[PDB]
């Protein structure tokens, strides 16, 4: 699941 936190991309 692609997550975007304040512009930063990560996979969780």
């Amino acid at each position, epitope marked *: *699941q*692609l997550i*975007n936190t304040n*512009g*930063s*991309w990560h*996979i969780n």
Partner: antibody
Amino acid sequence: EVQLLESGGGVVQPGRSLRLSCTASGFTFNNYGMHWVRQTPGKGLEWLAVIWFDENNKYYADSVRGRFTISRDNSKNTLFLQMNSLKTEDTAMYYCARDISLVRDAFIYFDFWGLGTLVTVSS
Amino acid sequence: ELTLTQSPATLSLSPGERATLSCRASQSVSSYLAWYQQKPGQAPRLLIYDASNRATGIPARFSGSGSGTDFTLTISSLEPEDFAVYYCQQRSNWITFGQGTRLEIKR
């Protein structure tokens, strides 16, 4: 051979809607995130939207949020962009693009682009 | 909001010469940077991702370096098929592109 064939482009009046399509072939569509990106001579390349492995996993640029909706139909290997409330400034070449999608541990880069389709918003 | 600035705007060279293209970020993007090539009438092609990794099918003469705010795309020895527009892209803070560098044949 990897292909991303686009359609749906054309002339549309301001305030009306268009739906763009991108049909993929030559790879396992289900396993890739996908993006729409547009280009104009004056503003250059502008990322618009991404959809990840799951249909509900989406993000948008501020410039199109609330007006454009990205979606995927895996059964037909097709990516869509529903474009509502169109403005003159939405005139552009529209590209569908495949995300590298964790291949070689990388993501959020555009590893394959379709030929693009021209949308002209005019009265 | 995070802006990328490419230089020079235009680069004039001949086949056989070394090409050096630059990309500077307004703030740090770590190694979260990619380079693309585009010829008139065609779609972009990915060259380099994560600052220094060469993409599939891309000839060894292309390479990338840098981190933080300063990055470089090098083409070791130019071929005629290499003249084109080159763009940078970051994915540290959302997604943005540079304005492009035109690589043209010198005469």
